[PDB]
Amino acid sequence: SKRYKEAQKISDDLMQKISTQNRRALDLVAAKCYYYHARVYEFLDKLDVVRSFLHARLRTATLRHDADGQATLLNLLLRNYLHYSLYDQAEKLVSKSVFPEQANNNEWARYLYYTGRIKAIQLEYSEARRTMTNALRKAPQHTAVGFKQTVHKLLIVVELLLGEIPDRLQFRQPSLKRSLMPYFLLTQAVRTGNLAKFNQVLDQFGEKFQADGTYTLIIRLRHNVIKTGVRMISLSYSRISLADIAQKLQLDSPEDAEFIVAKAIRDGVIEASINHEKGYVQSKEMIDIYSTREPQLAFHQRISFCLDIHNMSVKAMRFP
């Protein structure tokens, strides 16, 4: 059936001409059995021979039938290429385009989960939290079954690296709960500023970390504990001695006490001022500003560009 689909692929390279109004259905059906290419090849090992074959099909659809073709083939690329190294992070850069128009429906949302993990590998957390949230929020209606729960699982990972996360125990489903059970106490350890609470989570749940695949950020989150830990105590305490805060900051010597807060201002954490003698950290705050300009001026282009798209939709849907 894959060879018959290859005869469908050669005919996908020829006729046309002209408006092969049946090739969109060929994009649909073939994307299915291109995922059956994935499953059948995954019965033994990776499909890498079909990675050059997919690149042959993905590039030969350029630029003509890429519409709805390139989106599904790019997910076929991204999925298993996310499983097998490498370079896809910089490959999708030059691949885009975008590629418009987004089709079909949830296809672009799941693509923003796939490339969401990609753009999360660059660790920029504003684009990563917006691509992970837009991946899950844009996907109706399910069932089935658990991979729509998986995008929600890995979604708040970048929110754990942000330094502030809510407790998600109220969002647990009858399935997603039993799947993330270790990840529960993980994000609970991210909320708390305790080091041993987070390290014990790593040692105990490291097996589930192998099941999810996300590891490297678990050891560096200790720096999120020192920055959220100092954000906690500084804003918390009136004037805290560097010896008393040294328990939760685990070192906080008389020297590095300057950099903890100073290099936190470099990251935009706390404004606390410290005169170092013994010393003591005296945290004050005076700010009255902002909450104004970018939100309202962007809302102008937001609403207008939106209603313009809703025009491009409604105005063009009146053919009947």
Binding site: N75, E107, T150
Partner: peptide, 24 residues
Amino acid sequence: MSEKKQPVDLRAELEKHGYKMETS
């Protein structure tokens, strides 16, 4: 859908706050 992606796979506190008095 079922198409595409998904088919693939300080306490409260009671005791401690009352103890803070008689501690010191």
